[PDB]
Design a protein around this ligand. Structure first.
Ligand SMILES: [Cl-]
Ligand SMILES: [Mg+2]
Length: 382
């Protein structure tokens, strides 16, 4: 009897948890990180998955694959596929109607279906759970967006199967976040729950009804092309402008310099969720020139003020769509690292006239956490 795990297979990051000894442990990976980039890369000599692949994207852009969740269960001709292809540095090719990513690997052209890319991410999740537990892991609950269709769900199950997992169930991300908070451990009148999920690359607002432990998705809204990366990118452009003033050089077209800056911005955005100042510290950013600087929480908020305000439009839209008043939402659940941003929490809480936000489970972990609870239930370990 190996325990079952919960796996959040995310667009930008993935996360795995396990229920044991009465609580969920979110498992840190081989780099010590509790989330792993949903990235895979191929070199002359090896296949990288997770942090190692993300860390070399600028050095090897055409052979580094990400956003495979944007392709999973899609057909090559799909409008979304054709549009998304224009933003990716890797090739997507048509295999008799199905998209495949095409890379070079150990000197040969190789191509992979979306679910094969995702199975590699799921193999890494599996292995880092096995390293932490010291035993084999086979059973898992895997999560997907509430708006996934049959094709997209079945392709994600296929990624699981290819990875050597027995997928116990596919459950929706917003339901998993609600299970994490024990919101379905509840009898009495129907409760409306709003999940506000601002991930690295997508923004999902979901209203669920939960009645005697049974979920229904009442409405969904959001923007599948807005996420924490957009806020990072506002900071990147701000610091490109600053480096130009201070050194009269535009780094804009050195992709290695821009990626090092972007990584420093992603770290600074997380730092600004807890502190009012964060540094940007980069040795030899460009032609040997160092870049050591800093930013306030206020300036980061200013750079993103329109996008932050704009997150309330999908909330209004979910509410209209669900025929519900603000006041009829019983619980609000935060998901995604960006929901730690104080200014976002203020905007959302003021929108809900002071209503408290469920945020005590790390929001970048909450989907894996709910999946791990459901996995243990389905296994009989809870
Ligand atoms: Cl994500
Ligand atoms: Mg997510």
């Amino acid at each position: 009897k190996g325990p079952a795990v919960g796996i959040d297979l995310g667009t930008t990051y993935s996360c795995v948890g396990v229920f044991q000894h009465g609580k969920v442990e979110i498992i840190a990976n081989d780099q010590g990180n509790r989330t792993t980039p949903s990235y895979v890369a191929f070199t002359d000599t090896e296949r990288l998955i997770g942090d190692a692949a993300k860390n070399q994207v600028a050095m090897n852009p055409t052979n580094t694959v990400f956003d495979a969740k944007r392709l999973i269960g899609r057909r090559f001709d799909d409008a979304v596929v054709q549009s998304d292809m224009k933003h990716w540095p890797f090739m997507v090719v048509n295999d008799a109607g199905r998209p495949k990513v095409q890379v070079e690997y150990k000197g040969e052209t190789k191509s992979f279906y979306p679910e094969e890319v995702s199975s590699m991410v799921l193999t890494k999740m599996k292995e880092i759970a096995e390293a932490y537990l010291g035993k084999t892991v086979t059973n898992a609950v895997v999560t997907v967006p509430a708006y996934f269709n049959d094709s997209q769900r079945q392709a994600t199950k296929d990624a699981g199967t290819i990875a050597g997992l027995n997928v116990l169930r596919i459950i929706n991300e917003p339901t998993a976040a609600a299970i994490a908070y024990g919101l379905d451990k509840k009898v009495g009148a129907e409760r409306n729950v709003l999940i506000f999920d601002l991930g690295g690359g997508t923004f999902d607002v979901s209203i669920l009804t939960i009645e005697d432990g049974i979920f229904e998705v009442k409405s969904t809204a959001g923007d599948t092309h807005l996420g924490g990366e957009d806020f990072d990118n506002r900071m990147v452009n701000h610091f490109i402008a600053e480096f130009k003033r201070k050194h009269k050089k535009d780094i804009s077209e050195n992709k290695r310099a821009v990626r090092r800056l972007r990584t420093a911005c992603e770290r600074a955005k997380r730092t600004l969720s807890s502190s009012t100042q964060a540094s940007i510290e980069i040795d030899s950013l460009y032609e040997g020139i160092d870049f050591y600087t800093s930013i306030t929480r206020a300036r980061f908020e200013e750079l993103n003020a329109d996008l932050f305000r704009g997150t309330l439009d999908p909330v209004e839209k979910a509410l209209r769509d669900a025929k519900l008043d603000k006041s009829q939402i019983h619980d609000i659940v935060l998901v995604g690292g960006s929901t730690r941003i104080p200014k976002i929490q203020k905007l959302l809480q003021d929108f809900f006239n002071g209503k408290e936000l469920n945020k005590s489970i790390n929001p970048d972990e909450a989907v894996a956490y709910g999946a791990a609870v459901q996995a243990a239930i389905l296994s009989g370990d809870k």
